[PDB]
Amino acid sequence: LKFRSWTYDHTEIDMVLMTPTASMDDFTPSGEWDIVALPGRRTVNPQDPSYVDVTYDFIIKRKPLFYTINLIIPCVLTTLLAILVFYLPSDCGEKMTLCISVLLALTFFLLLISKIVPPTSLDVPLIGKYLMFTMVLVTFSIVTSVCVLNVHHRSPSTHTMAPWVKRCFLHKLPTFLFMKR
């Protein structure tokens, strides 16, 4: 808060800050925020006369339990549901439903968090960056799930199993990944 006068200047009035800190006397506690310190200073510019200023700084902490209990827990929830479409077998028909639904919920929380945040480009919050990372990861999960669902429905009458998938995806990797038929 910058208090100064528009009529007079430093050559005609002083402006003496009395106490170093603003008092906290009739203060009602806000419930959402916490005042932690309230310093105040008097700004004058050398080699620039006719300048007076009294500024008060309010450094304010947040009581964070509301946005924690309403946004951080569903964030880690829908992120935890994203490395989970691969344990589901392709013999069932419910993979693409789960993948599209996880991407839908992530875009929903991104559009929700872009509303309570200010529209500035200093830096995105860590929630928005985290959801962007997880959203690109879920899109790669969709394209590799379609690729792994194409190879499930390959019949002997229409395809020929090449020798390189014979030597790679049948012998080496089921021993490398502890599968063992």
């Binding site: 992120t79 994203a82 490395i83 691969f86 344990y87 860590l126 960056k129 985290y130 990372f133 997880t134 990861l137 790669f140 999960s141 590799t144 792994v148 990797l173 990944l177």
Partner: peptide
């Protein structure tokens, strides 16, 4: 295979983001 790959990448991603 892609389960293990994306699990490892997601764990390193969470660590690298929430390092501070």
């Amino acid at each position: 295979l892609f389960l293990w790959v994306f699990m490892f990448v997601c764990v390193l991603g969470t660590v690298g983001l929430f390092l501070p």
